[PDB]
Design a binder for this molecule. Structure first.
Ligand SMILES: [K+]
Ligand SMILES: [K+]
Ligand SMILES: [K+]
Ligand SMILES: [Mg+2]
Ligand SMILES: [Mg+2]
Ligand SMILES: [Mg+2]
Ligand SMILES: [Mg+2]
Ligand SMILES: [Mg+2]
Ligand SMILES: [Mg+2]
Ligand SMILES: [Mg+2]
Ligand SMILES: [Mg+2]
Ligand SMILES: [Mg+2]
Ligand SMILES: [Mg+2]
Ligand SMILES: [Mg+2]
Ligand SMILES: [Mg+2]
Ligand SMILES: [Mg+2]
Ligand SMILES: [Mg+2]
Ligand SMILES: [Mg+2]
Ligand SMILES: [Mg+2]
Ligand SMILES: [Mg+2]
Ligand SMILES: [Mg+2]
Ligand SMILES: [Mg+2]
Ligand SMILES: [Mg+2]
Ligand SMILES: [Mg+2]
Ligand SMILES: [Mg+2]
Ligand SMILES: [Mg+2]
Ligand SMILES: [Mg+2]
Lengths: 208, 328, 96, 58
RNA sequence: UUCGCCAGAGUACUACUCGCAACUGCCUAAAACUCAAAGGACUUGGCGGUGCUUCACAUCCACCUAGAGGAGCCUGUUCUA
RNA sequence: GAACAAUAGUAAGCACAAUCAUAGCACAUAAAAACGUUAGGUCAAGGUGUAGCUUAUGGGUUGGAAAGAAAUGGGCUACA
């Protein structure tokens, strides 16, 4: 790490600076940020103040990347959002009056909602006691649950897809499947709940 | 070693006269800085250690401070605390404690007389006052100290400084005061330059990951950037790279109010894109008010990126990765 | 203490009372002995490891012109004098 | 059938308990050292005892 | 003041002998032979599947990414020659 | 052989530290890392103790050191 302990993470949100007069405690926070003369790290290349970005997209885009092809990973994430948009637009056209104002045509809304349904609620961690390993359920933290949902999405669409079907279209199908709570990822989430509920009497082993 | 110092003093003055004689200058004003530049010329030592170069200075500054003789011919110690081992430190402690009692006695008398003419002068924040460092204190008492002894002495001064302050005590205390240099993170705003009927154009310099960017921004044109004689869209096909150039302008809501031409060399597509981003941030400080310049720093625009590629160690596959380690 | 029994006049309700008649006899010789070693140009050191009269004893020695040591006593001070103080050091001729 | 379509009330409390247990676990260690429950920490008692040591000998 | 016991270690709470409601028993108790030591207490170090407290930022667990062991080829050992 | 509201330790040498290099500082990385441990590796870099050879364990010329049943380590290219 070329940054010393004094350097801190920069603040990028423009709206945080343009309307500071409506609050007092937050004003004391950033006025002392430079009054303490604390050094600020350089702005990361990925994050930007553009209003069209989203933090959950960047993390998902990074995991899709293999090697160092950020261009290819960004290209795949662009097509997948387009592919989802095309399918929802077509379904909207062929619908009745009541069905028309039900379909969502916002890929970002679909993407955010899809991952919030693939996150497990309670995980498992092996614990060694008496020379044997017992799968003990634990209340997984929010960051772990969010990361675990993304990994399951990538793992499924990389392994059990056909060789002919492209990556952007295969991932688009699973997002719609997870949006309706019927995708194989949702099945895997329930399977982890099945094992956690089966070993509900082993929760006493953990010591935290 | 009093005489040895005296011999060094007289010959250094004689030696300085010879140096001025051969240098052909005025010996009456052969200052130490002139001596250093003369020595560095006559004896051109190429060495990286700054302390290993030839030197000829005042022997008082060169030789370390020496303890004086502590006893007379009959053996009687001159000071009354010589048998405590550390006479200088404890005498300072004895005097410091005595001042506190005198202040307490003086304050007690003032309370009896119902007068409070003293004020707390401990607060020297605008001057930037800090207490003596242990190393500096050891060079003032000419005696070695310890961490426990130093902490006790400083805390005693705080008790002395927290009481009502007299004129004599403040002179005593201020000998232990040190002033920090000026601390500030404000940047120097480059004044606008006008050239050949050209109005409001500023220049910036940026560098990131083996890529230097030269950006000059005109405040009288429309929104366009000309990098290396070609349009920026053609030069930066990647959407992310063109997002980097947007980041400074979009933060100030001046996307279309400036005409720029750039010249960046070296590095890849992202290195140049980051370099041009840095150069615009520094070059745009002239057109922007001072308050938003601080906002620019808090967002990380104005700080150079120190992350550079590391070397490859001899005996490893890469910068950190080592070969496979077969245990058996 | 067991060795202070002869010097005790008695005990008053569990509180020992020191016989001042023996104190006066001892103090008379102590002051007489102290002056004579000072008359002959002798070094006198005041030693007292008590954190209530350290300043008073330190100031007392300054007025008399003699030396005092009411601080922490180093291990090799009086025995290994040449290393602690200096090459040639005159040891004190009396300690109080 | 292992679906949280009707278990929202229970799921949130489980998250709330996890956060509540997390908060108490990650703050007990620091404050308990100097809280002292009215009795001085072991470091202070050691210094106090050294000033008035016990005398087995003499 | 008085009684009992002790004369290197192993052989040995053993062999033989006297007494015993004991009969695979108890008490009494050697030698041949072997060794130049056996033994009591202590000091430092190492170690402990001993306890208490604290800690592993490539790290032991929990946990992240990319690989080796599977195939061809290149090269280096062992064995075969 | 230590107790800082200090109870026998003291000042120097080597090492750590600081400094230097990577052309600003900082951070990071290099570089450094004593006394010892493993009779660790190297008589085949070279030198050399001791032991051995001296028309031979020395010197030169010509030709030739093949081959992989099989096992394994570290790698490159892949299994899209
Ligand atoms: K030990
Ligand atoms: K291999
Ligand atoms: K040899
Ligand atoms: Mg690599
Ligand atoms: Mg005997
Ligand atoms: Mg025997
Ligand atoms: Mg028996
Ligand atoms: Mg028997
Ligand atoms: Mg590892
Ligand atoms: Mg590979
Ligand atoms: Mg293989
Ligand atoms: Mg092989
Ligand atoms: Mg040191
Ligand atoms: Mg440097
Ligand atoms: Mg460093
Ligand atoms: Mg190294
Ligand atoms: Mg170093
Ligand atoms: Mg060997
Ligand atoms: Mg080995
Ligand atoms: Mg060998
Ligand atoms: Mg040889
Ligand atoms: Mg050989
Ligand atoms: Mg030889
Ligand atoms: Mg031959
Ligand atoms: Mg194999
Ligand atoms: Mg290797
Ligand atoms: Mg290829």
């Amino acid at each position: 790490s070329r940054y010393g302990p004094e350097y801190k993470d920069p603040q990028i949100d423009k709206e945080y600076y343009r309307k500071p007069l409506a609050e007092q405690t937050e004003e004391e926070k950033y006025e002392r940020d430079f009054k303490k003369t604390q050094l600020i790290k350089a702005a990361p290349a990925t994050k930007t103040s553009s209003v069209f970005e989203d933090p959950v997209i960047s993390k998902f885009t990074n995991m899709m990347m293999k090697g160092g092809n950020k261009v290819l990973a960004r290209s795949l994430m662009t097509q997948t959002l387009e592919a989802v948009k095309r399918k929802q637009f077509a379904k909207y056209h062929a619908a009745s009056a009541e069905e028309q104002a039900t379909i969502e045509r916002n890929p970002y809304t679909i993407f955010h909602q899809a991952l919030k349904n693939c996150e497990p609620v309670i995980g498992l961690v092996p614990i060694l006691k008496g020379g044997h390993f017992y799968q003990v359920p634990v209340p997984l933290a929010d960051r772990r649950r969010r990361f675990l949902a993304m990994k399951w999405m990538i793992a499924e669409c990389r392994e059990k897809k056909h060789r002919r079907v492209l990556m952007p279209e295969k991932l688009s199908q699973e997002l719609l499947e997870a949006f309706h709570n019927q995708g194989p990822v949702i099945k895997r989430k329930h399977d982890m709940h099945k094992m956690a509920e089966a070993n509900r009497a082993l929760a006493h082993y953990r010591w935290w | 070693t009093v005489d040895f110092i005296k011999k060094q003093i007289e010959e250094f003055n004689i030696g300085k006269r010879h140096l001025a004689n051969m240098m052909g200058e005025d010996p009456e004003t052969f200052t130490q800085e002139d001596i250093d530049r003369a020595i560095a010329y006559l004896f051109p030592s190429g060495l990286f250690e700054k302390r290993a170069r030839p030197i000829m200075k005042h022997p008082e500054e060169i030789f370390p401070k020496q303890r004086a003789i502590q006893w007379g011919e009959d053996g009687r110690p001159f000071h009354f605390l010589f048998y405590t081992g550390k006479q200088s430190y404890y005498s300072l402690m004895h005097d410091t404690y005595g001042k506190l009692l005198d202040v307490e006695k003086h304050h007690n008398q003032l309370r009896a007389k119902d007068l409070l003419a003293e004020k707390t002068k401990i607060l020297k924040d605008p001057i930037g006052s800090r207490w003596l460092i242990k190393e500096e204190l050891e060079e003032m008492l000419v005696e070695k100290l310890s961490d426990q002894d130093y902490a006790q002495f400083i805390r005693l001064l705080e008790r002395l400084s927290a009481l009502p302050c007299g004129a004599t005590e403040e002179d005593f205390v201020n000998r232990f005061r040190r002033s920090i240099p000026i601390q500030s993170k404000k940047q120097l705003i480059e004044p606008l330059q006008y050239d050949e009927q050209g109005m409001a154009f500023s220049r910036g310099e940026g560098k990131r990951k083996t890529a230097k960017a030269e950006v000059v921004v005109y405040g009288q044109g429309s929104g366009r950037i000309d990098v290396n004689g070609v349009d920026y869209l053609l030069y930066f096909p990647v959407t992310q790279d063109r997002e980097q150039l947007m980041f400074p302008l979009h933060f100030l809501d001046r996307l279309g109010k400036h005409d720029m031409t750039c010249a960046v060399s070296g590095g890849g597509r992202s290195a140049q894109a980051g370099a041009v981003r840095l150069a615009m941030a520094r070059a745009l400080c002239s057109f922007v008010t001072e308050d938003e310049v601080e906002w620019m720093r808090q967002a990380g625009l104005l700080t150079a990126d120190p992350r550079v590629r590391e070397r490859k160690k001899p005996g490893q596959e890469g910068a950190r990765r080592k070969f496979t380690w077969k245990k058996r | 203490h067991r060795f202070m029994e002869p010097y005790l006049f008695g005990s008053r309700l569990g509180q020992d009372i020191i016989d001042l008649e023996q104190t006066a006899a001892h103090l008379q010789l102590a002051l007489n002995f102290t002056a004579h070693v000072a008359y002959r140009e002798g070094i006198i050191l005041f030693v007292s490891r008590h954190r209530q009269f350290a300043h008073l004893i330190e100031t007392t020695a300054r007025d008399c012109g003699e030396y005092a040591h009411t601080r922490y006593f180093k291990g090799g001070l009086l025995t290994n004098a040449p290393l602690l103080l200096g090459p040639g050091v005159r040891l004190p001729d009396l300690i109080i | 059938e292992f679906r949280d379509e009707a278990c929202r009330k229970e799921i949130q409390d489980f998250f709330d308990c996890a956060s509540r247990a997390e908060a108490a676990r990650k703050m007990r260690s620091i404050q308990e050292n100097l809280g002292e429950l009215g009795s001085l920490p072991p470091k202070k008692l050691n210094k106090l005892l050294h000033r008035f040591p016990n005398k087995p000998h003499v």
